[PDB]
């Protein structure tokens, strides 16, 4: 069997504006039953208590389930819904719809490698596990599972790994206590452990070097981790390439070197299959289907030898995404770009992945 | 009487960090008596009640007067102090020190036109004038006066005009901008009633005296700098910045080389909120956002700095308005 | 036809937490078909683009229609859903569920006047009407209609009037233009408030000119305005009574106290725990003050970028300090120095 | 010698508005040379990078020094300048000017105990000390020194202890590393400082202190500590307000504990124990007897209030909101917007002190 993945980027005027999204299926353009991921940007704060984000999640699930003719509960483990809140500046709220179907015959004429999607699920992550080696392990297992689901064995062909974990709630800690266990305290821990899990499963870090005392040098260049809610089941969404891919897309990745750097974005675009020096032409820009950039706050308050306010700013989270969005969009000309972050900090360095067209 | 203008960009770790600024003069590198403008970015909100901004203003004046050996009151109309609050993201707080002296003796091999600075003062602007034609007129007079002070007569050689007006705010700014338009012939005076590509207007305080700071070019310039300008087409556009850089004298297609980047001394970009919430055919949140003022500057700073690689860039704006934002660049000549 | 109004205040841990709300009906405690108003506080910004607020609105409707066995579209003109965003400080997010049944025996036991609820609907308010006398008039009609629905004729027995109006969109302005008409949120609110004043005789239709009891808000494109009115009447079978007061300045508790007292609680300065518990709900609108002078001193309340949030924080602190109940309906934050506050207490 | 302390509360329309402040001295009403503390509220964010706060600090010092006829550097260790940023809602920015002179003879007719002010200085607090027992100890020493400076030996007569400590700067950590020491910021310094106060006042036994329980064992606290930290200055500072029988002051201080975020009883207890006799409300006259309130409104320990969920810990504007609430409470009782409402940092009981008039018979 050969995998055929597609991406459709549709706008949202509000967290609950599913008009264009529904039109995608109503028009016959996309089969709702083949949808494997929804990756969205919503308007709002982007903070841990952003209810708009949840609103978008709920709305998108309800729309998709309606289009499938199933009740909403069914979508439980069949689709990855990842909504990142906060869409400052040039970032246009949207949802990227990811489909994948498997076909008996490989189309001919497809150059090099092509996009493939894998998904994975963690064993329940108990509150006692959060930020600790148990989480690291369970995530690693899920990532390996996702690599297998995508039919990928070379980790250098894995270009983006999104992990959704749980965070510590008061009900969670109460549960831990009620079973005589302790907790690390929250979201910062879950995220770090998750990132480390990715690093382990992709061989970027040796498992021997992991311990609860060293969790919070050891990095993944392609991890995009987030945490929240009470759901103990973690989830992995993996985007890679393979020679067996029937997709008309290819993914690449890069590392943004500092807060003002465009080269990481460019590298993502270029390694995905677009050939250019400095700028993209309109046509080349249009070949870029989606960019997934995580713009976490920098490691320091020094930028090109000068002091910046980016760590001191009460609005740091918002500002970081604003800057990232400005950069990405200035290159691609496409406001509907997936700009996540600015939680906390390759030192100084942020991941960015690009999905571009791969034509026969 | 050739004019020789220079710019020295020095960092500030805080609104009252005048260390590097003082070192500029203490080292003999710059003559404090030749300082004609201070143009700074401070950390803070950028809003009308930003006291950090005022803190930077007060601190800078006190430092400069100390370096001059005069008391602070004397600087009253000899130096233009313009502090724009709010330095989000990649913008590094700083002060651009602008000097100008006249020299008897025009030095040989300077290509084309060169940077010149002019300054002007309005008649008192009465509260009854704010946002009305009287303001428009008084500002226009001050701009003409500034053009004369710089020894410039061709308005196509004027590349930046900063106006500082009083408040009782959006009105004062609009009237001031119109004043600039009138004085540069961009708009006919007849078309003005109570019912510019290069204006950078701001207002605040009770001070009835408006102030103009004008940056232009002239053939008679002994300056080792040149200024250019551009128009930012929408919120995601880098072409206006590039045009500013290019027309100032840097020859490039798409990107600058490290050397070329280093040839850019300062950028003065005003990033007012867009005219609409549509950008490249898509909805954006930029007008709805409670932090719009901050975000606009963040975006502008990201753009400018991504091109020049210099965090100490003068990114102002955040005020309210489908596009069209002024940017000036000062480069080596 | 004797009216029996009740209020059930239930917590929400998030805009879409309808657990306690659903349990209200599932337990048999409240009949969902008798629900006439949902009045909620949600977590969020309280600003014009607060989607959490909308999230709560949608969630509440979807929960009430479920408990009614209808689909959600029906709740159409039958229930007033009013969600005020922004719950800073001591304000606990919640929904006050307002039921009203008509019935047969007037009990006795039941001293003086009692709570009654009236509802009303405006003629479509066209964009050309917003902020103008047409709106004033249509709102006035809707308020009169609501007074009638409640069986009240004396406007001195009306103690709270909530108006939901439309605001000006682009699509609205485009509409006005396409028919050659000229348009004038702040506007819609003022006109609505003036409507209430007219209908209650506080201001003479042929003219400093406030309503002491109006609580107005505007938003969306829906041309149909809505009135929710809370009053008293001698014909009321309710175990509750409503009163109102005016908050004199930003630091004043006397308006809250007056609301409580005139609703039927007898106290001088403080309430006892028991008296506190007699207070079922407080509806206070804490709009920004008229000036930046307070007890002879300068305050930052008008300059503050977070003014809207801070005003509610202050109001919530005041109300809750008196009643000891975090689940209090504290709205406002808009720009204007006297604020309305109403209290609903046990009759008993 | 008998101490005579006074307090003059004057408004500020901006961080650098020293008009009313200067008029205080120019009018002869107050002797600038007797000023021992400036305690101010400024407009601004209240956050760690609030430059308006610093602006107020600088402005006040410059004004005071000008009034003294000395240069500003001299005020170095003679005056405690404590500016708390962020004045939301009903809080009117202002500066409370604290004077103290010593007199040979005690005026007669002064009932009970009276206000006295003490000041103290820590040994340099090294970055390796921040949040650790070394800080706890150095602060304790400084508080004992302040108690002695005020002529007070009974810790039950100490009603407010303001500690200004250092915080961990990026250059501080570099220094620590450069000397082979470890570190761990502002929350730590504050906790350690608070513990220092608790130790020096006998509220907590020294034996019970350890680096592993400073932040952990929340049982250990001081009912009267008001701690803050910031800057690079290694020298901590204590400002202590107490009572004594030897006081010639026409004021008396009291304190209370705010039980939860919605509680007025702590404020009331402060007022009452300071010398105002009332049950529930104050009369206008009684209100006017209250000269200043110093309340620290740090965020609550939990998000449960009177059995319900509140947003106060989740809110991105928590720091601001906490002070808005506190200010509402204080001002609702005293009717005086110029009240010293600090806090906003993190943790469910908050200290509040009140200074009222104590008139001769």
């Amino acid at each position: 069997r050969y995998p055929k993945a597609s991406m459709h980027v549709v706008p949202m005027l509000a967290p609950n504006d599913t008009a264009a999204f529904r039109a995608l299926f109503a028009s016959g353009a996309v089969d709702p039953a083949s949808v494997v991921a929804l990756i969205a940007k919503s308007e709002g704060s982007g903070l841990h208590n952003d209810h708009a984000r949840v609103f978008a999640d709920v709305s998108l699930r309800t729309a998709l389930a309606e289009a499938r003719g199933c009740p909403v509960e069914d979508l439980a483990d069949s689709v990855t819904v990842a909504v990142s809140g906060g869409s400052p500046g040039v970032i246009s709220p949207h949802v990227t719809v990811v489909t994948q179907e498997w076909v008996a015959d490989l189309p001919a004429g497809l150059p090099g490698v092509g996009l493939v999607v894998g998904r994975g699920h963690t064993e329940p992550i108990l509150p006692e596990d959060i930020g600790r080696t148990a989480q690291v392990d369970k995530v690693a297992d899920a990532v390996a599972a996702a690599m297998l689901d995508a039919g990928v064995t070379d980790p250098d062909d894995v270009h983006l790994v999104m992990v959704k974990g749980p965070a510590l709630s008061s009900r969670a800690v109460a549960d831990a206590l009620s079973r005589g266990k302790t907790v690390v305290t929250s979201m910062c821990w879950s995220n770090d452990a998750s990132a480390l899990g990715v690093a382990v499963a992709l061989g970027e870090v040796k498992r021997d070097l992991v311990a609860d005392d060293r969790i919070r040098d050891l990095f993944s260049a392609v991890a995009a981790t987030s945490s929240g809610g009470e759901k103990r089941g973690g989830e992995v969404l993996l985007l890679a390439n393979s020679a067996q891919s029937a997709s008309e897309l290819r993914i690449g990745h890069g590392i943004t070197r500092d807060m003002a750097d465009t080269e990481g974005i460019k590298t993502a675009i270029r390694t995905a299959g677009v050939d250019f020096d400095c700028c993209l032409s309109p046509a080349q820009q249009a070949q870029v289907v989606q960019v997934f950039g995580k713009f976490v706050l920098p490691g320091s308050d020094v930028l090109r030898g000068q002091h910046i306010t980016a760590l001191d700013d009460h609005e740091a989270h918002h500002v970081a995404k604003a800057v990232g969005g400005a950069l990405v969009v200035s290159i691609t000309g496409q406001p509907m770009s997936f700009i996540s972050g600015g939680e906390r900090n390759p030192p100084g360095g942020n991941p960015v992945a690009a999905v571009v067209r791969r034509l026969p």
Side-chain angles (χ1 to χ4, degrees), chain A residues 1-170 172-185 187-229 232-342 344-360:
Chain A
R1 312 290 174 274
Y2 303 77
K4 199 180 160 251
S6 318
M7 281 183 188
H8 305 270
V9 180
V10 299
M12 303 179 74
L13 298 165
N16 66 331
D17 172 28
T18 49
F21 178 65
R22 290 178 271 98
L24 209 67
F25 310 119
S27 89
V30 178
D31 178 13
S34 58
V35 174
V36 302
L38 304 175
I39 306 166
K41 283 302 303 183
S42 54
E43 185 174 7
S45 68
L47 301 168
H48 77 277
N49 68 338
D50 186 353
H51 298 302
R53 196 195 69 73
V54 175
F55 193 18
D57 185 302
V58 166
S59 295
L60 287 169
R61 287 172 184 285
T62 291
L64 178 56
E66 261 169 38
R68 287 194 180 185
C70 71
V72 191
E73 307 94 274
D74 296 357
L75 297 181
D77 299 300
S78 61
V79 193
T80 292
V81 183
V83 187
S84 160
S87 297
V90 300
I91 297 153
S92 179
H94 66 270
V95 52
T96 294
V97 187
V98 180
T99 55
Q100 187 164 261
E101 48 156 333
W102 295 77
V103 296
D105 181 58
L106 181 67
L110 294 173
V113 302
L115 174 71
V116 58
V117 181
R119 297 190 43 257
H121 298 259
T122 311
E123 293 148 49
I125 299 176
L126 303 162
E128 57 261 46
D129 298 333
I130 295 178
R132 296 184 176 145
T133 58
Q135 176 170 29
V136 180
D137 282 338
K138 298 174 157 133
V139 165
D141 293 341
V143 174
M147 287 184 82
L148 186 79
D149 181 61
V152 172
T153 64
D154 187 4
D156 295 8
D157 286 333
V158 178
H159 295 270
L160 181 78
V161 192
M162 286 178 44
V163 184
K164 294 163 71 153
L168 287 163
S169 75
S170 55
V173 310
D175 180 72
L177 287 173
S178 86
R179 307 184 285 94
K181 305 298 210 257
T182 60
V183 305
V184 281
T185 65
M187 271 184 159
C188 71
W189 285 98
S190 169
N191 294 350
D192 285 2
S194 287
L196 203 58
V198 185
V200 174
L202 305 187
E204 278 164 330
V205 171
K206 186 43 199 86
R207 183 49 182 87
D208 284 354
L209 296 167
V210 179
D212 309 261
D213 46 288
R214 59 186 54 160
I215 288 176
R216 202 111 175 78
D217 275 321
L218 311 179
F219 49 68
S220 178
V222 292
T225 59
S226 52
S227 70
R232 307 210 195 107
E235 193 168 353
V236 178
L237 174 65
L238 185 145
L239 302 187
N241 293 320
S242 80
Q244 297 69 251
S245 167
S247 299
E248 285 190 4
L249 306 160
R250 181 167 38 247
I251 191 160
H253 85 255
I255 308 293
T256 82
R257 297 183 131 222
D258 61 34
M259 211 178 187
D261 180 43
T262 57
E263 290 304 329
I265 294 147
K266 289 176 183 178
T267 289
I269 294 171
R270 185 178 300 112
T271 66
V274 183
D275 282 13
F276 68 108
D277 186 3
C278 232
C279 284
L280 298 164
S281 56
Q284 288 175 314
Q285 283 182 317
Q287 283 173 51
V288 182
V289 175
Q290 190 50 290
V291 178
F292 309 89
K294 183 149 222 156
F295 291 86
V296 303
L297 301 166
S300 89
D301 64 10
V302 177
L303 181 66
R304 312 296 170 87
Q306 303 297 347
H307 178 72
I308 54 164
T309 71
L311 299 184
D312 295 328
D313 194 330
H314 186 54
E315 296 303 321
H317 298 14
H318 203 54
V319 166
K321 289 184 302 232
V323 165
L327 297 178
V328 168
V329 181
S330 73
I331 285 160
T332 70
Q334 291 179 62
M336 299 188 301
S337 307
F338 185 78
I339 310 302
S340 66
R344 270 50 99 285
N345 262 325
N350 277 334
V352 53
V355 172
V356 308
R357 307 234 173 253
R358 170 218 190 190
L359 301 183

